[model samples]
Target chain A: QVQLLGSGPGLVKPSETLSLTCTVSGASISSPGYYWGFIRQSPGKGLEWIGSMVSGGTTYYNPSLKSRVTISMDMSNNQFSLRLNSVTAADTALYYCARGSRQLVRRATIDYWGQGALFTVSPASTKGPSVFPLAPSGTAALGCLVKDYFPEPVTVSWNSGALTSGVHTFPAVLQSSGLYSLSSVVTVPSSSLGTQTYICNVNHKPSNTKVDKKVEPK
Target chain B: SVLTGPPSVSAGPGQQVFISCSGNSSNIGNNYVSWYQQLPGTAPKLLIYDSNKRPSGIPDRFSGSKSGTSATLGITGLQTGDEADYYCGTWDSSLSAGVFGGGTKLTVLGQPKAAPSVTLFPPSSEELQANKATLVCLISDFYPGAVTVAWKADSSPVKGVETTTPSKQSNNKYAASSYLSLTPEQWKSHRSYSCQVTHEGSTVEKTVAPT
Candidate 1:
């Protein structure tokens, strides 16, 4: 029987450390048989597993955050804390703290969750994807390309005979700009030429926008 | 935008097995892959949903992951009772439809493939007085727990049949029951009714004649 209340500084300066704490209730933070950790959600990354720890400061972290993340328990204070250094706007998210079962074949399972606290890390640039079309305008492949948007997780859907016939939608590719690009294409059969319409829809959650480029049948 | 699950896979009890589902980005890419388990005679149940999250009550022995255009389901402690069919599904962005792969059958080797023994019980007089007829088939001692059931009258296939999920017994055996409902006139028109159970490539049948 335990509840987790998570708290953190609502804002942090660029290059500063983000400090957060989980105060425990209904159970002891020093309890030996549980895993305490953090998981955060953002428009770009969806859900990211930051890290987890047990009694002896044993910690496991997502490799992406391994170098700058630290987690430890404060038994005397009845809480545990997280410190993430060198933060940026990408670090802005709804942070959560949780308690997990120690094992079931070494399976770490989170059973309790905090209500989540909002945080903003200082200063960054944001952009939305540029939409364009790719086509030979022949009996061939017709498609759309969405390029360069920050923070991930975008959705691309298509409308055409391809819904039942065939089409290919590629996974998003991440570029050094810390942005993502995606694409989708459908082939127009000679029989369906000039008879069907094709459209591509891209939804970028962070910018709260939808962009697209449609193909008119040849 | 098709998902592919190779026909069959095998492992020994207590061993581990990795089941893979291969597909293109149109289906397994833009969306998440969901895995299901179909026990004999039952609809599919979710095992690893949302690409990798287990539904409540699912044991940790099962794990799931997605990499690129494919996904994997890992069974940590394979057991004879786990023998069943597995399937992977996801939404196809290009197709604009939900899609599933052809199922893969999981075989837990070295375990006995015992056949089920069926016993048919005829409709009771008391049931007929109430203007109904019901027959029960007790299926016993099956191993691997998957059995197909059907009901028949004389030489013709019949309907209104229902079967229970296989239950594991203390001795590691499996059991199930099927019931057939009938109208009094239909029950009397048939000379005999039979319960047919198929398991591990064999079929067992028990017939009952009304008194």
Candidate 2:
């Protein structure tokens, strides 16, 4: 019955700090034998375990991010926070707060997670949707390149009938223009080409506009 | 940037079991190594960290080391309850990421060794009305509780199958099941569908032909 809610700034400038907080409900932050932690997924990629700390102040971190990441807690308010210093475009990611066990049993494994908060680390950029060819003969993959559409963070997803599993979107990359660019991909099966249509949708929360494009085979 | 370890290993009590993990220089050579142990029906526990340091309260029997883009986990005194799956993890400099080994299974040879009782159940008649056929594979009564179940149809590998996680029964043994969904046409084609169970280095298979 434990729940975690995460909140953070949507946009941050390069060379600045990114701060996020997670509030806990249905569980006490001071509860013994639990570790509160932060995990982040880069714009279109895999998960990264930033760091974790127990209420008693024992902390562990990923060596790659250890120097730039700091995780701390506020036992009285039942919340924990993450601070990343000197962020760059590569630092743009979706951050999550989670609960883990403190004991050696299941150590470093997250048990509960909060809804992710988008923390973008660049200017703004936008792009329309594009379709490309893939293997499997008639199969195709759709890409929506949202570049230079930012105050920091945006969201993307695919809408289609013939898409099977293996859809993935990459983390946003900071472009040389100092804006953020994100790409999303969805595979369309050969049988789904003519009858089923695919759509790629991107949401710019700062602008409150969701742009969607319907894909067609060339 | 992933690490792969030995698929399986066996040793008796008081003997040493060594599991090795291999990766590229960008990963294994540049970062610290950690290992985790996962018992059946339980979450994984960290056994070794920073290449050789055990967490507080962990026994001295478990140890780790790294050499030339490879890492090794060693357990000096194997015990019966020590049978579990082990995974190795390290940071990859190329991807700015952390990678994990696929996992190696440790089998501690001890007393009361036994094999699983396996059964294959076909779909009921009511399922045929819906033009659907489902087959169930039940495996029970296995000690150490480590078994691999796979499904095949007409001697061909079947994809997209469902399997239940192994559950510990009251007898301190293990039980598990796997299910295969098929179209009624494929079910009644008189084709052979087989379920294979591998345990303790031995494999047993059962095939059912549509009547």
Candidate 3:
């Protein structure tokens, strides 16, 4: 029943500090037995654990960024924050705040995650959250394409039709233009029969935008 | 890519253990390293940050340190709850982002180990003629809940519909039950059926014959 909300600027100049805050609701920030932290993802870089802090004001940062990163908590505000100094274009990413538990070994498994906040250390631009259907093969194969999203990260999903086995999602590849290209395929069991339908939805969290494409079994 | 040192390690209570994480120059060598601890059926937690600093209230017994592209997490005076998975993480410059080493599973030794007691309960004799019957394999009192249950008929692999339920017991041990559904034709044709339970790298089996 816990929820986290992330807020930060969508654009910043290179060398400027990147600051983001995660506000919590339906839970107490000062509650014992819980830890709050941040995580980020970039187009090609995968997911990164930034760091975490407990309600008691103890903080931890990733060693690589320890010199530049600071994680702190504000119990009165029911929130936690992240500050990355001297950020460059490479620092552009979708940042997320999460609620975690403190166990025998300091469990960092995020129990609940906030919608991501996009921060770009470059000039901001608006483009398509476009989706294109990929060439389909057998009766079960279905897929689509996406490109030209900002802040380095995007979310994609299939809304309809139960996937019989599982979905095949490829890594989001960085495009030459510095945007990102991502694709996924889902195979429906033939037993579904007749006019199997599905919808592909993509969200660009930084801009608070999305795209949807309808796909039919070939 | 990132990799963990010592795929697995074992230590007893009051003992100390160290797990290592190694990554590429573009990642671990250039970025800071973080550590996490994960228990079964739960999310991982941040154990050590900035390579060596402990969070508020963290005991001094758990510590981290870095050397070039390698990072180590040291745990002292191990406890039973310390038997969990640990992972190391850092940023990857080549990928222009972050990465993590494969996780290490810590096994706390010296805890009492007990063999699971297994029982096979056959379906009602009348149900066997109906061609729809289920064989139940019950397993209880096993340590290190990591277990596998397999079904066999007449010494061959079974392709029956199977379901297994595993639950953590009150004492931190484990109990599980598996059921295999069969058709009367197959049940009548088989001379023997067996349910095998594997744990701690060893297997215990229970067999029964339908009259």
Candidate 4:
């Protein structure tokens, strides 16, 4: 199953419609019951779903965006896209297009996602932390995980906080069930969840470099 | 307003966390609120924006406090998906401050339990050494989706980069490492190439240099 990724410029002045397309290949757009979906990532933020559509042409949207958003597909070209009219600073987001095919029974859930596109609503001149680090072990306890294949001795800590000074290590349980179900146990007081960014870092020494890939929720 | 759920039966490991909120339209107009994950299995974590401000790595799930005032966080196809807590939060129309629902605990019970282990493959250092003087970028561990990895030299985008999935060890478990070969000049003087990983609703970036 081959998937395509697409994105557009972020700084769209308010009231403008933001549009983008994701192209797919290696599979026919004619696949039955499958639909295309829309998701977005804001700067220094997480992923958010905008809406989805079935291959049959049925639609479901994030009710919040229902009034202003429209998602459609182009089976002739094997592509899908989104149109957000009357865009605002809030609309300046990274949009991603994906093919959601795997469904249990008849319900729709995202089984696959697309690479993303970045569009800024409020263009800031400053670029934030380049490295989003994920720890190797105990980090998962903190709601963070190292990206896959990142080296061991993965890192987890507050990117900025009271305990932002040193490196902490925790044990992680890497499960063997085809899916990656590993977690790190951090001893941070539950109170810490309130203040600070806990980062997960994984290093690839061959490049003598490390990518701070933090995959944690909350 | 009403919030209720025992979670759908099919919900388990790898399944998403779903919550439903019900209420009146008078309270939910124009106010943007969001759902979040804390521990994964617990109540949701809340981030504010349109309801703004999310920490990092958290995805955007929203709760409608109005429009009949019901909203939900639905986690689909669970498979030991995430072990964090989830939450629903919004503006307290009365106080206009941040408000959150009690959190939901996420516990992913793997479906098969006996599947093979997922392996993390470190990129070959020898390959790095050979391509050290050229344009090279690394894309690591993309989660449950598809993405394109590329390098940008100067402000201009460079085309024709190659991507390789180095972690072929896991099926359901999503993780892999890929490198885009670059030149030294591309690394040092090229206005800092951003290693951008684009995924549905999210993108993670890192700047690279020739050491």
Candidate 5:
């Protein structure tokens, strides 16, 4: 039960350096068998893995951001940090610092994540739409749950190539994490089977940002 | 190659074991070496930082030290539950990469070992990758957290397998998995493929094929 809490400047001037730190609790930053990572998702860009570092090592960075990104740790402080330089409007995103398993060499598995710290380069602000925001329980047809988007009347759409009937959008509810949760569902005729593409479109009104998540079935 | 810990160490309960990590000046000597403990099926936890500092909850019985290009993890009051893997990690400025040790498995003797419950999952139609299907062997309920898994196709030895370190389940038993990959054509070509798990002086073989 490790917890990561991220903090960053609310607004950074374009082309300036953005610094963020993830204060760790219930665990150490230098623990082995685990690595610390930073990931950011601009509503338009979805998710981009920025870089990773563990213990006392230099770090492994994303080639795309390698030139602009730097990750390091301070053991005595029990925290790790992220720095991105030459920022631009495109760098505006909800940045998160997370912990990943080092031993799962086959693939990247993020076991713990920090509550996102919103960063807007010279512009707007917002909260709560996670990288992956779809959840369906039993008895629900297809539920797309979008959490923590600021400003009211968040537009959530269940877009199918064509199907629109039985589509429902629940009212937003605020949670303890200071974010809101909205769930949308659409019912298809049980008779209509086979795989189809279903998309969840969440528009974060405050920042004029929208993320379209597609779930395809067969 | 910056840090190396012995592959295995054995000591009886109530005894003390010193696991050493050998490296060069650029790694263990000049930089701080941290030690971690990986219990069965769990993520590694920090035990020693800066070579000798113990975290808040760690007992004094588990300690660490450094002396010129070498570091050592010392565990006293060793118990059966202390049987786990130990790893040494640090930064290497020369290579410009942070490196970790291969891991050291510590076995505490005096108790009878438990054999794992084996289950082999045949390749499914939902291949993990294109033109590829994967076989999974679920091994659980073992003790001491030590075991080996081997794969075979048509009774012949096979390679390119991946097995995880034993994880301790809620029941205090150990669990692990191994993955075997092949094309669906290969899955159907053989009468059966087997996953053989050896633990505590016993080996259990589980086989599966196209159904």
Candidate 6:
């Protein structure tokens, strides 16, 4: 009975740093005291107590977002994400996606959740998922999953092929019966790797919805 | 600053009001709090941890109280139609803040709570029946408010002046009776006594006193 879903951007720009994704369907986090939690609904709502994780990575952040927050995962296909580096206007909020991590022997408590997505920086031109490979120097590491659970929570993005920005690694895990399994990896220098196509999009929430796919390299 | 919610709390069969997680020693430096009770889909039963302790068989009225930072989960003799939902976790630094207390909607105060099904007319009837050393803690059927009967001596808390709560056999079931006036040399060096029927509360209260 675990179902959580969260889409992407309602807006963002202040300092630029707001990534969201909490997609989960049936279940699969390797069980045994799973983890993956986040809460926010200040754009117009209830439920706000975000922090929890365990699937080996062990991480918790809620002391009021603990300096901008950050949670990551991508265990093959299970999917898991949440990044809020530097952004303002009170961080805006409205993002949600749950599972359980109060740790009663990992019995946790969220079960399943997801029904939020509102960034607020007002730029409006969203373009997150797009990763490509399967030939011309092959590479197949980014596990893909779109519009995963709870009213929906899925949005992926990554590009480490032929670029020079640095810093990229996605390993997801948020079990405890919420659902999400993610994995990302993009490494290409094989001459810009056939143009460009390293995307992982799923964004879907209140109209600005979207869903795309492009995986190459068996 | 970060204390999530729910890890265990499913009480249904009778009375249930189990809440825990107290932290406010100046915003939680350490007042230590813990509580649990999972029985309906099953898996969380460690009622009251750290704070007021009570992990052996738990039954001093199934109680744990703490003020100043808020912590209370009372369960009177209200049985029947016991549903679930009640959580209040603690711990702040390592991350732990579970508080879900808004589940108290019981409906059994009329008399449908009984658990009686005992059979012992066998060859094991060593009793001085009416002289006062009456020991009749025979439980049967078991379903009164989902069970919770306490009586332990060397294990602690066995000061019986006379307590009886056994009588409901129309199909509901239950049985209990305690009286102490020992003089058969105090019932032959009586030191070990026990009678427990738990749903989950670890019965703990040993400040280490009883050599």
Estimate, for each residue in B121-154, the C-alpha lDDT of model 5 and write its tens digit.
5543334234556665667678878999888885
lDDT of 1 by residue, A53-158 (tens): 7755466775668789998888897898999999987888878786665531123344565766656665544467776654323346566656567544456677
Ten residues in a row with the worst lDDT in model 4 chain B?
B114-123
Top candidate when judged by TM-score against the true structure: 3
Candidate 1: residue pairs that collide: A44-A151, A44-A152
A-chain TM-score per prediction? Answer: 0.53, 0.58, 0.66, 0.51, 0.55, 0.28
Q: What is the lDDT of residue B101 in candidate 3?
A: 69
What is candidate 2's lDDT per residue for B40-137, written digit by digit as tens?
43335678877888878778999999998899999998887778878786666665544567778777676586798766656545456756666656
lDDT for every model? Answer: 0.68, 0.68, 0.68, 0.45, 0.67, 0.45
Off by over 4 Å in 2: A1-10, A14-16, A23-28, A39-52, A56-78, A84-98, A103-143, A150-155, A160-185, A189-197, A203-210, A216-218, B1-211
Query: What are the chain B TM-scores of all models?
Result: 0.58, 0.59, 0.67, 0.35, 0.59, 0.26
The alpha-carbon deviation from the true structure for residue A6 of candidate 4, after best TM-score superposition, in angstroms, is 1.4
Ranking of all predicted structures according to TM-score, beginning with the best and ending with the worst: 3, 5, 2, 4, 1, 6
lDDT accuracy of residue B30 in candidate 2 = 69
Off-target runs (Cα >4 Å) in candidate 5 are A5-218, B113-172, B175-211
Model 5 chain B: worst 10 consecutive residues (lDDT sum): B121-130
Cα lDDT tens digits for candidate 4, B67-149: 43655555444545344445454433443222334445554554342221121211123324554432223333344435555
Clash count, predicted structure 6: 60
What shift in Å separates residue B53 of candidate 1 from its native position after superposition? 4.3
Q: What is the per-residue lDDT of model 6 for residues A1-218, given as tens digits with 9 covering 90 to 100?
A: 66666665455667788788766667775564557777664532234555667766566666666677778877666768887777776777667666653353323345444555656553334333222221221432222322113221334454323332321222222323333222223345545545656554444443355554464432
lDDT of 3 at B58: 74
